[PDB]
Amino acid sequence: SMNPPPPETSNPNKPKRQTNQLQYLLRVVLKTLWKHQFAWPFQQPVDAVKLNLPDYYKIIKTPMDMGTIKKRLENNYYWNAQECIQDFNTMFTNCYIYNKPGDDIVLMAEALEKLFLQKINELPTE
Ligand SMILES: CCS(=O)(=O)Nc1cccc(-c2cn(C)c(=O)c3ccccc23)c1
């Protein structure tokens, strides 16, 4: 079994910007979610090999995780905050698509998403 390459976190051709919203997303939002008791399964790409999930990447074709988001924020990959917010949303949605309602991982994702949405209500004006 093999995992796919992770999502891109570096691309010298992609224009980059360091907006106050992106700074908030790193310094406040990501940092707070990262320490949550349920964050650990989301801190790196799903390792379908290690977890014996051979169908994971047959079903999930747009993978995303908080480790990738952290690298994108820390390595100035984004142009705007919406790109980052979309990455979080992709992470959560993938979990809800792949797993059954009521699976522990889904409950963990839902708790993180509730927190994420509350925090982004305080995103500063651009
Ligand atoms: C740090 C990423 S890991 O892959 O190295 N470890 C890890 C450990 C426990 C749980 C999962 C996990 C994560 N997600 C997002 C899932 O959807 C999922 C679905 C079924 C079974 C396990 C998981 C991954």
The secondary structure element, H or E, covering residue 103 is: none
Using an 8 Å Cβ cutoff, are 25 and 80 in contact? no
CA dist., res. 28 & res. 21, Å (int): 10
User: Is 39's C-beta closer than 6 angstroms to any atom of ligand 1?
Assistant: no
Between helix 81-98 and helix 104-120 the angle, nearest 10°, is: 160
Instruction: Indicate whether 8 belongs to any domain.
Output: no
What are the CA-CA distances from residue 77 to residues 5, 38, 56, 93 (Å)?
17, 26, 26, 22
Instruction: Give me the number of domains the chain comprises.
Output: 1
Instruction: Indicate whether 9 belongs to any domain.
Output: no
Question: Which residue is associated with the tokens 């809800």?
Answer: 96
Instruction: Indicate whether 84 belongs to any domain.
Output: yes
Select from 51, 92, 93, 112 the residue to mutate for testing ligand 1; criterion: most ligand atoms less than 8 Å from CB: 51
Using an 8 Å Cβ cutoff, are 88 and 73 in contact? no
**Experimentally, how was this structure solved?**
X-ray
In sign, the C-alpha dihedral spanning 94, 65, 80, 77 is negative
**Residue 78 one-letter amino acid:** Y
End-to-end CA distance of the chain: 44
CA dist., res. 108 & res. 32, Å (int): 15
CA dist., res. 53 & res. 37, Å (int): 23
Q: Which of 68, 7, 63, 10 is nearest to 43 (CA)?
A: 68
CA dist., res. 97 & res. 109, Å (int): 12
Instruction: Indicate whether 61 belongs to any domain.
Output: yes
- Rounded to 5 degrees, what are φ and ψ at 62? -125, 75
Distance of CA 60 to the CA centre of its chain: 14
Instruction: Indicate whether 13 belongs to any domain.
Output: no
Using an 8 Å Cβ cutoff, are 84 and 78 in contact? yes
CA dist., res. 93 & res. 89, Å (int): 6
Instruction: Indicate whether 107 belongs to any domain.
Output: yes
Instruction: Indicate whether 82 belongs to any domain.
Output: yes
Domain that holds residue 102: 19-123
Q: Helix (H) and strand (E) counts for the chain?
A: 6, 0
Instruction: Indicate whether 44 belongs to any domain.
Output: yes
**What's the resolution in A?**
1.2
